[PDB]
Amino acid sequence: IPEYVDWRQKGAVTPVKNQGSCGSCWAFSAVVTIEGIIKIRTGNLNQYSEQELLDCDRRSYGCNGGYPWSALQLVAQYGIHYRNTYPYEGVQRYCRSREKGPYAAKTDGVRQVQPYNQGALLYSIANQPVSVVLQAAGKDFQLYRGGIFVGPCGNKVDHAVAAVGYGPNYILIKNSWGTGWGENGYIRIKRGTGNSYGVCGLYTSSFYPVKN
Numbered sequence: 001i002p003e004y005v006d007w008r009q010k011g012a013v014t015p016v017k018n019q020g021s022c023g024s025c026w027a028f029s030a031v032v033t034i035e036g037i038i039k040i041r042t043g044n045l046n047q048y049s050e051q052e053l054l055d056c057d058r059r060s061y062g063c064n065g066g067y068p069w070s071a072l073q074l075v076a077q078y079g080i081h082y083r084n085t086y087p088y089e090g091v092q093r094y095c096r097s098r099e100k101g102p103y104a105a106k107t108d109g110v111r112q113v114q115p116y117n118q119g120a121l122l123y124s125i126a127n128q129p130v131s132v133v134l135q136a137a138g139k140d141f142q143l144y145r146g147g148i149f150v151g152p153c154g155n156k157v158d159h160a161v162a163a164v165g166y167g168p169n170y171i172l173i174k175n176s177w178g179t180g181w182g183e184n185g186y187i188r189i190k191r192g193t194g195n196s197y198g199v200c201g202l203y204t205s206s207f208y209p210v211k212n
């Protein structure tokens, strides 16, 4: 795998979104991955519906939090609509999939990256954008204004994001707090410090969609 990876440069990442005041981080994260894999597999870059996940993944708790793995299982079993068909409203409403026509895309499965192992995550990332979680509750994470983030931070994961690249000493993450946060809405998190949890516990739980 290359020393530097940036799916943004391969045209496999769509613009940065804002989840607003709805705990929909999990939906956001899952979509970053679907968007990526489709581009990688088909050559088209489409935006997919986070709202669709928010309203339809009954295993998650809407604006109260959720599971990227669950969201991703949903897309593999049923499929998902384009973002314009089912735009984001930042509030949970009934599932309108059928109301909206046939799904735009379907994946084949979901896989877990072996946890607390940097090498395994970098490998996956080299393959496609991956759903990852970290501890975002601390003020330092929140007031992040750019640079290589190194903490301070515990490993009390509570936020789902997506890993879209890496370099020599960091992992490139796409957040969903708007373009006004961090590095134009991205964060470069320090990698290779030997902490098995990963900084902010970045290696606790990572998934990615499978598409034949």
Ligand SMILES: *[C@@H](C(=O)O)[C@H](O)C(=O)N[C@@H](CC(C)C)C(=O)NCCC(C)C
Residues within 6 Å of the ligand: 019, 022, 023, 024, 025, 026, 061, 064, 065, 066, 067, 157, 158, 159, 160
């Ligand atoms: C992320 C966001 O801010 O949207 C969101 O809070 C999330 O999905 N988070 C995990 C939060 C931690 C505090 C553990 C999560 O908790 N997942 C399930 C949450 C609830 C019990 C409903």
